[PDB]
Write a protein that binds this ligand. Structure first.
Ligand SMILES: *[C@@H]1O[C@H](CO)[C@@H](O[C@@H]2O[C@H](CO)[C@@H](O[C@@H]3O[C@H](CO[C@H]4O[C@H](CO)[C@@H](O)[C@H](O)[C@@H]4O)[C@@H](O)[C@H](O)[C@@H]3O)[C@H](O)[C@H]2NC(C)=O)[C@H](O)[C@H]1NC(C)=O
Ligand SMILES: *[C@@H]1O[C@H](CO)[C@@H](O[C@@H]2O[C@H](CO)[C@@H](O[C@@H]3O[C@H](CO)[C@@H](O)[C@H](O)[C@@H]3O)[C@H](O)[C@H]2NC(C)=O)[C@H](O)[C@H]1NC(C)=O
Ligand SMILES: *[C@@H]1O[C@H](CO)[C@@H](O[C@@H]2O[C@H](CO)[C@@H](O)[C@H](O)[C@H]2NC(C)=O)[C@H](O)[C@H]1NC(C)=O
Lengths: 97, 315, 97, 53, 53, 49
């Protein structure tokens, strides 16, 4: 399983930023202009449409790939080993070869 | 013990996030906004992350009966016996630590977490979740039997020890509030409720907000003016529903308890089927208490495997 | 491919490079809300887990019993095992006795 | 939620519970083209009819 | 009445038994260990026997 | 036969002799538990009902 890491977005109040590509698997970055977010106490930013929010998300190995994972293999040259009992005359022994 | 395991949270603070469905059919701003449910346990346990912190009081100390959260600006209190988890019926909670709750839940279509508020109100957050745990072994049982066999599985350990898995922590952002303003002739007052309040006024001086109460000369009144609380001494979790304060590296660091550990679960054993021997025929009576898997294959060169889940009596 | 087994791939458990193809998408936030909307393909690992069906143990020919640690097939009833024998004199008995 | 009955109860002044149960097909039709049960945190708006509070 | 009908139990005592699933997913030793449930009623009533009195 | 109509049979309501074929089985108790494990075929009367 993967893990989609979505950090808190940077909201540029009455300003503008640029997306910076990073070396992250399945990386996405988006700058949205004209945002007017709200909080519980009221409006977060100051202007009406002069604002940008930076959306960033990526895929990372889950915390339990170390525990929960499936392995893809190639199988060839199967080696056979068998357990045999030899009991003749007075002896009665078991060996593996 | 529990104290040197909970001391990691005191440096943190609960947060208020946007929950799209708070029990009823509408959004509101609740302290139990569910962030992410983790389901890595083979026995059906699920982990729920909530906005409120469970087991920590107003000061920061550890109790087994208090839940701290955000109601406006000030931290407040809640009791633990009222935390409940709902999917289709009532879920069995096995352990709570801060933002994280683990519980045993029946199969369901939703995941609701609610507690009783200090205002005697009920505050909940509802999300959509496919909770359809896979069977452990070959019998689709729901209740652990009193006899059977043990089958290995994965489970969350009920310990508070720190683990490699953790969650990001950072400084809280600016928190605006319209009520921190009152319109007065000339000197518009910004009631200084809190530690530090920032303002910026088009007609007035604006600039930095500093602290304490100030009497800003301006005719803009409430309009062209608003204030936000800043410099929170504690820390927030970088939730997806809260704006980022800044493009800097994270500040605090909090682990995720209840690590996945190897374990085994008792499973029921089906009754031996009744076999009548026909001439190179095999007929069996199947009496399952629950959906039971019947499997056979030929021992020769060309096998003919079978599959069928048995829920009633069949032949 | 996203949504199937192998949507994310890692060469080793200690691998630093991770390949991820989950068709992650970003979209405008709604007005007056800070939520970082994104739509992404669900994990193909869980899809495989609940669509795997039965393993090789349930379909192996010749009554093979498949175990892991290490991956092996035991007690398969097929073929012959040639035997070469080197018996000393001590084992045998004389016809006089 | 979707159900087969409709029971309404209150706690009586005698600390008793007084209820009334009736049979009702409560199977609401989907709003739009997805059979969802929980309002999401993002999406699109579809017109509908509601009781004003 | 009820008193000369309950006088039969005074000479008895409740017991603690092994319940395999006490709400959560694990066993413990509870005073409500269910022994047998009987459904001889055509109207859907069931009888539950518990450890406590 | 167990699990079908007539799994247990009695000639009369006042009969003292009772025939029962329910394939009752007994098995080891688990370690540290007193529960008398047993597995038995369900009643054929309720199945017929
Ligand atoms: C549940 O219990 C499982 C069994 O104890 C745990 O899985 C074990 O986890 C350890 C540590 O991560 C793994 O150790 C690795 O071993 C590899 C080599 O692979 C194995 O194969 C060789 C033969 O080539 C064989 O001799 C050994 O079994 C090897 O360990 C090393 O190269 C690594 O450095 C590392 O030591 C075990 O492989 C793994 N066991 C198995 C059978 O997968 C599991 O972590 C536990 N999960 C929990 C705690 O929930
Ligand atoms: C403190 O608030 C002042 C206003 O009191 C904010 O000033 C605002 O600054 C933004 C800068 O982006 C101006 O928006 C636009 O500027 C762009 C420049 O590319 C231009 O294309 C648009 O036409 C628009 O003007 C905005 O006009 C300006 N408002 C003013 C000067 O009244 C300032 O950003 C705030 N500073 C803090 C504390 O954040
Ligand atoms: C040789 O000795 C071995 C070990 O004592 C015998 O193994 C056991 O044989 C008897 C039954 O014949 C039992 O004690 C066990 O069922 C056997 N144990 C096994 C199969 O591991 C073995 O049969 C002897 N072989 C000979 C004399 O031919």
């Amino acid at each position: 399983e993967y893990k989609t890491v979505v950090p808190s977005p940077y909201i540029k109040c009455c300003g503008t930023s640029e997306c910076r590509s990073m070396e992250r698997p399945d990386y996405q970055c988006q700058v949205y202009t004209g945002v007017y977010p709200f909080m519980w106490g009221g409006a977060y930013c100051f202007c009406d449409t002069e604002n940008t929010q930076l959306s960033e998300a990526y895929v990372d190995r889950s915390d339990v790939c170390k525990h929960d994972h499936a392995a893809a293999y190639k199988a060839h040259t199967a080696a056979m080993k068998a357990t045999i009992r030899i009991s003749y005359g007075n002896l009665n022994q078991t060996t593996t070869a | 013990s529990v104290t040197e395991h909970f001391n990691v949270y005191k440096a943190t603070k609960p947060y208020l996030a946007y929950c799209a469905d708070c029990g009823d059919g509408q959004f509101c701003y609740s302290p139990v906004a569910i962030e992410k449910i983790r389901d890595e346990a083979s026995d059906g346990m699920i982990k729920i992350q909530v906005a409120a912190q469970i087991g920590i009081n107003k000061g920061g100390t550890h109790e087994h009966n208090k839940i701290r959260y955000i109601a406006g600006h000030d931290m407040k209190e809640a009791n633990r016996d009222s935390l409940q988890v709902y999917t289709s019926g009532v879920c069995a909670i096995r352990g709570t630590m801060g933002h994280f709750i683990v519980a045993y839940c029946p199969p369901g279509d939703e995941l609701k977490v609610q507690f009783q508020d200090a205002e005697s109100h009920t505050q909940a957050c509802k999300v959509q979740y496919k909770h359809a745990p896979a069977p452990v072994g070959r019998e689709k049982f729901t209740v652990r039997p009193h006899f059977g066999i043990e089958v290995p599985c994965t489970t969350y350990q009920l310990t508070t020890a720190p683990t490699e898995e953790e969650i990001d922590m950072h400084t809280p952002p600016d928190i605006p509030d319209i009520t921190l303003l009152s319109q007065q002739s000339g000197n518009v007052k910004i009631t200084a409720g809190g530690k530090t309040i920032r303002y910026n006024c088009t007609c007035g001086s604006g600039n930095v907000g500093t602290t304490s109460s100030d009497k800003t000369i301006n005719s803009c009144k409430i309009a062209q003016c608003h204030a936000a609380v800043t410099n929170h001494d504690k820390w927030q979790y970088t939730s997806s529903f809260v704006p980022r304060a800044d493009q800097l590296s994270r500040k605090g660091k909090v682990h995720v308890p209840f690590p996945l550990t190897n374990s085994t679960c008792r499973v029921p054993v089906a009754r031996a089927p009744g076999v009548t021997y026909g001439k190179r025929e095999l007929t069996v009576k199947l009496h399952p208490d629950h959906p039971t898997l019947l499997t056979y294959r030929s021992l020769g060169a060309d096998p003919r495997p079978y599959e069928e889940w048995i829920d009633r009596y069949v032949e | 491919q996203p949504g199937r087994f192998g949507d994310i791939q890692s060469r080793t458990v200690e691998s630093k490079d991770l390949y991820a193809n989950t068709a992650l998408k970003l979209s405008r936030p709604s007005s007056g809300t800070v939520h970082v909307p994104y739509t992404q393909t669900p994990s193909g690992f869980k899809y495989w887990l609940k669509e795997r069906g039965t393993s090789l143990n349930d379909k192996a020919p010749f009554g093979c019993v498949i175990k892991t640690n290490p991956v092996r097939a035991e007690n398969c009833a097929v073929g012959n095992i040639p035997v070469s024998m080197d018996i000393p004199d001590t084992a045998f008995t004389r016809v006089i006795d």
